[PDB]
RNA sequence: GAGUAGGAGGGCGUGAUCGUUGCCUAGAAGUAUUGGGCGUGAGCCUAUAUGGAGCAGCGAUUAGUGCAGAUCUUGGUGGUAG
RNA sequence: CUGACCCGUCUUGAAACACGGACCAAGGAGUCUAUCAAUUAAGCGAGUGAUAGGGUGGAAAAACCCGUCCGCGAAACGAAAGUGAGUACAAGGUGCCAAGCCGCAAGGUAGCAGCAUCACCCGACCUUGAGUCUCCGACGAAGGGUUCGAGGAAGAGCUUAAUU
């Protein structure tokens, strides 16, 4: 008698929450959807802002005979060139760090003289560059994935990124794009967010692995040429 | 190829012990905390399960000077629960009033507890009583054995106090200079 | 407490090819997407003017 | 038995889990048989763990008589647990005469005081005592007697 | 009780019949072949028996509970009906034993499959019967 | 016979293996190369100080002096 | 997702014993297979032929329990060679 | 078509111009007894367990009951003479820290087991002592250690099987 009652009462209560949260979480959405839009615009809009304030700068400059240096890239992309074999431990710790284990592996890392001293080791195992917020975006769109209680998840939905992110202000992927970009308040939880960039064959052969980029090699920094190379990867 | 310690595939040794107990009464014991645990979001049974998982040595003895000792105000009206088997103390004289749940009673320990005006219980009871675990008072024995003296450091290293395996204690025994 | 489902996921999808992904992390997309169109379509006329 | 043994898991793997540079071999390899060179290439051991095994202590006993040396001890919290509860009882309520406990009968000679004793009185009948046993005894309201 | 029995009996069962590590058993009552608590019908409460008789009836064995009572119904092992309409009697009686919806849909194959065999069944003793006299 | 003398080449490597392991640090650490005259203060001046619980009896013996 | 020395976890196959379920003069064991299949693999099931009296599964108990080697034991055979 | 040295072995190094192996069947190598330990499952728990032996019992060497002692634990420290877990109303303090109870949360309360440390205690070795008596050797109020111990401080053991 009374078991199967308060089962019955259990199912009622639960179309109710599914009812409550049904309309709750539609209008929390409308709301989304909106904010989406609005901040993907705005933010696009302050990219845009800046570019043409540098191309600006510079005219004013070039006019005086003076020179106007933009600010210096404040995010980094680096690629794992050489395989895992046969390295000093220490090398082997640092790139652990720089959170590339395996070969073609991209990941971003802010600009530290920590982190850009943290790569004075690994430099003829690894390239790295200063990536256009285009590459950034493209890489997190093709080649995106999130850490979630430790697992690989593909991204797909926004629903994650508040999921993990959420609370820190990140609603969506263009707002995870904007930190990146911006190196804003929160970097590093945005970047331990996105999983290791497991990347594809380069489309142009490397020129020389054992070289450095400025020998026609490919270890160290190509300052703004990472970009061809994540192109030739995605 | 990755450079990932044991390859990711790193053993979990945080976790409850696959019991291998034969009563059958131990696996059902287990199957309801296992509910409890998954189910209820309690700290309290989650403990019971890990300790009811233990070694069948790493079960360890409550004795009722042991309770005793370990009582306030408010563990006096609480429900307490041992992991383990409860045993009578000899020395003990007079025996309070208490409603105890264990494994296992000496039958000592359970005459003296009820014939005192206690009440003996056993876990499925204490599932119905407060599976929060509400009211509750969860009793870990104190671990003593003979096993430890000879573990720890060895035996005639400097500072060693621990015991050597010895067939009999006597003046001749290991109990002479050594070569020194 | 009541028994919850398992995770969910959804296979990786490229929004470079794919519109609805793009759409679906990026509406802004649609909008940018139509206006490209639109701003494209700005005239013969206008563009031999402008240059 | 037999089926649980290693063997049975090792069959064909040439070596027996005794290794194929330093396989499985008789005396010289235990390093001599039994307790053998202890004192030298075994040095680390015997030192080690079971630090005091060579040499002599103090005095030799050349027949030692071990009955007559037999003395069991008593603690004094183990007491009233000897006699019943009846017992203890019936004299916390009754102050007329006070309650006689012979640790004799129970295989005892020695009392030694380890606890304390309960407020009731208590006459106890031993072999020997010690300061403290007694101590605790007379301070319990109770008496010592020496028995034989 | 079902629990204790599955632990007590889901190895040892007697039964019990293996195939490629796949366990099946030889219970009357088993409302599945294979040996599970669900399919052990000795042990839980529903579990079925059918027997064919007198051209129709169809005799049910409903899996019964250990009973002490004052007069003895049938075997202790459960009770015993004979059903003259069979098919649908039997496909009521079941709907009211098995409530859940798997137990239902498996009892049910129990009778759909066992009626058809019991039709053929009759045809070859028919032959039979008329293979002894012709 | 010949052989390899001193060789430190595995032994670094072995021992990193597992980590270098480091001691605890406890609160509380042992008094060797502690001078007793210290020792003995720190004995007294505990037993003295009421702010400090001691167990019963002792307490009834710091009471009375 | 490498692995010798080595270690751990699961599994295959063989006697005999206490149980449990059975198969066989309407043909057991054993044996041969360019018959048909099942296991990643130890191994398995079936078919046909031969054979002519005993067998088999499942749960446990136990072990003189698995061989390519040891100039290994005993027996039987080659090429050299009419 | 692409790939493909002879296995077993010892060796830093084997297809080796290292050794054994022409072929096949059957046989063929970590056992058995004892010992201690660690772990796992069992029983009982300040106890545990018999052995020998008694007494019954199936056709039967089983089983089933009894089994005043004994083992091992329950007290230790000493070569030993010897002493013994010293205020009867004790069974501590501190740092890490789990449950339960509060609290949306922040955190708050509490403090089981373990670890570290300080304290107390018994005994070895030192040191000190009013007074007491069966006064020549013992007793003990008070007061201590730079030290020693396979120890106390609300007992964790004992029997069975298995593996290493
Ligand atoms: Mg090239
Ligand atoms: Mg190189
Ligand atoms: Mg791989
Ligand atoms: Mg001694
Ligand atoms: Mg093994
Ligand atoms: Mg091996
Ligand atoms: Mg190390
Ligand atoms: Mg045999
Ligand atoms: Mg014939
Ligand atoms: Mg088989
Ligand atoms: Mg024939
Ligand atoms: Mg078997
Ligand atoms: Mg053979
Ligand atoms: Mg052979
Ligand atoms: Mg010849
Ligand atoms: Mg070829
Ligand atoms: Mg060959
Ligand atoms: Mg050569
Ligand atoms: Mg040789
Ligand atoms: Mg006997
Ligand atoms: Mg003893
Ligand atoms: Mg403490």
């Known amino acids: 008698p009374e078991n199967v009652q308060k089962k019955l009462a259990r199912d009622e209560k639960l179309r109710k929450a599914k009812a409550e949260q049904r309309k709750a979480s539609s209008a929390q959405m409308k709301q989304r959807k909106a904010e989406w839009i609005s901040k993907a615009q705005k933010y696009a809009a302050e990219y845009e802002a800046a ?94 994935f999130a850490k979630v209680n430790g697992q690989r998840i593909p991204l797909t939905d926004n629903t994650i990124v508040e999921k993990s992110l959420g609370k820190f202000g990140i609603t969506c992927v263009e707002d995870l794009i904007h930190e990146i970009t911006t190196v804003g308040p929160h970097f590093k939880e945005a970047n331990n967010f996105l999983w290791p960039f497991k990347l594809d064959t380069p489309r142009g052969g490397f020129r020389n692995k054992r070289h450095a980029y400025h020998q026609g090699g490919d270890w160290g920094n190509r300052e703004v040429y990472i970009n061809d190379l994540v192109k030739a990867m995605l | ?20 107990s034969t009563n059958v009464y131990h696996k059902l014991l ?4 296992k ?46 629960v041992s992991t383990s088997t409860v045993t009578n103390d000899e020395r003990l004289l007079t025996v309070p009033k208490l409603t105890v749940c264990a494994l296992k009673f000496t039958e000592t320990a359970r005459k003296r507890i009820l014939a005192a005006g206690g009440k003996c219980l ?59 | 407490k009541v028994a919850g489902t398992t995770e969910t996921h959804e296979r990786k999808k490229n929004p470079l090819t794919n519109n609805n992904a793009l759409f679906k992390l990026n509406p802004a997309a649609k909008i940018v997407k139509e206006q490209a169109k639109k701003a494209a379509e700005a005239s013969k006329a206008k563009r031999q003017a402008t240059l | 038995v037999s089926h649980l043994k290693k063997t049975r898991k090792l069959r064909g793997h040439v070596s027996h889990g005794h290794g194929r540079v330093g396989k499985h071999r008789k005396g010289g390899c235990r390093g001599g048989r039994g307790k053998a060179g202890g004192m030298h290439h075994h040095r680390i051991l015997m030192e080690k763990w079971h630090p005091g095994y060579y040499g002599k202590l103090g005095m030799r006993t050349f027949h030692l008589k071990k009955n007559p040396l037999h003395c069991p001890v008593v603690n004094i919290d183990k007491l009233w647990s000897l006699v019943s509860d009846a017992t203890r009882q019936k004299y916390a309520e009754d102050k007329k005469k006070v309650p006689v406990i012979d640790v004799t009968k129970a295989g005892f000679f020695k009392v030694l005081g380890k606890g304390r004793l309960p407020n009731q009185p208590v006459v106890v009948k031993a072999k020997y005592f010690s300061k403290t046993a007694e101590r605790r005894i007379v301070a319990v309201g109770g008496a010592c007697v020496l028995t034989a | 009780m079902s629990q204790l029995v599955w632990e007590i009996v889901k190895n040892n069962n007697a039964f019990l019949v293996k195939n490629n590590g796949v366990a099946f058993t030889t219970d009357p009552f088993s409302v599945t072949g294979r040996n599970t608590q669900v399919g ?45 309409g069979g098919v649908q009697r039997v496909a009521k009686v079941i709907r009211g034993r098995f409530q859940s919806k798997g137990l239902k849909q498996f009892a049910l194959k129990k009778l759909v499959n066992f009626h058809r065999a019991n039709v053929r069944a009759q045809a070859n003793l028919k032959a039979e019967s008329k293979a002894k006299k012709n | 016979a010949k052989s390899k003398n001193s060789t430190n080449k595995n032994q670094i490597s072995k021992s990193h293996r597992n980590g270098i392991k480091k001691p605890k640090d406890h609160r509380h650490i042992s008094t060797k190369g502690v001078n ?27 009471n009375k002096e």
Not at chain 2, 53 to 78: A, G
Not at chain 5, 63 to 81: D, P
């Open chain 1, 51 to 144: 570019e043409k304030k540098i191309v600006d700068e510079k005219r004013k400059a070039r006019k005086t005979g003076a020179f106007y240096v933009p600010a210096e890239a404040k995010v980094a992309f680096a690629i794992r060139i050489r395989g895992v074999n046969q390295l000093h431990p220490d090398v082997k710790r640092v790139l652990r760090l720089f959170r590339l284990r395996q070969l073609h592996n991209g990941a971003f890392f802010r600009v530290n003289k920590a982190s850009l001293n943290m790569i004075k080791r690994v430099l003829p195992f690894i390239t790295f560059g200063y990536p256009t917020r285009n590459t950034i975006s493209k890489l997190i769109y093709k080649r995106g």
């Open chain 2, 1 to 20: 190829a990755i450079d990932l310690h044991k390859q990711g595939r790193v053993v979990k040794r945080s976790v409850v012990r696959q019991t291998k």
């Open chain 2, 30 to 33: 287990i199957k309801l905390y």
């Open chain 2, 35 to 80: 509910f409890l645990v998954r189910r209820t979001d309690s700290k309290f049974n989650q403990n019971i399960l890990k300790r009811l998982s233990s070694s069948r040595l790493n079960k360890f003895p409550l004795s009722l000077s042991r309770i005793v000792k370990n009582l306030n105000e408010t563990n006096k009206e609480q429900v307490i």
């Open chain 2, 122 to 180: 056993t876990f499925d009871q204490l599932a119905l009583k407060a599976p929060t675990g509400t009211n509750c008072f969860l009793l870990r024995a104190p671990k003593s054995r003979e096993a430890y003296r000879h573990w720890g450091k060895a035996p005639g290293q400097r500072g060693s106090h621990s015991a050597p395996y010895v067939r009999s204690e006597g003046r001749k025994f290991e109990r002479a200079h050594g070569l020194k």
């Open chain 5, 40 to 84: 052990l019908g000795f042990t839980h409460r529903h579990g079925v028996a059918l027997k064919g008789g007198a051209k129709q009836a169809i005799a049910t064995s409903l899996r019964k509970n250990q009973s002490h009572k004052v007069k003895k119904t049938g075997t202790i092992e459960a009770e015993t009906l004979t059903v003259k």
């Open chain 6, 36 to 62: 007793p005259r210290f020792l003995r203060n720190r004995r007294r001046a505990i037993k003295n100080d009421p702010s400090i619980k001691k167990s019963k009896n002792l307490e009834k013996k710091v």
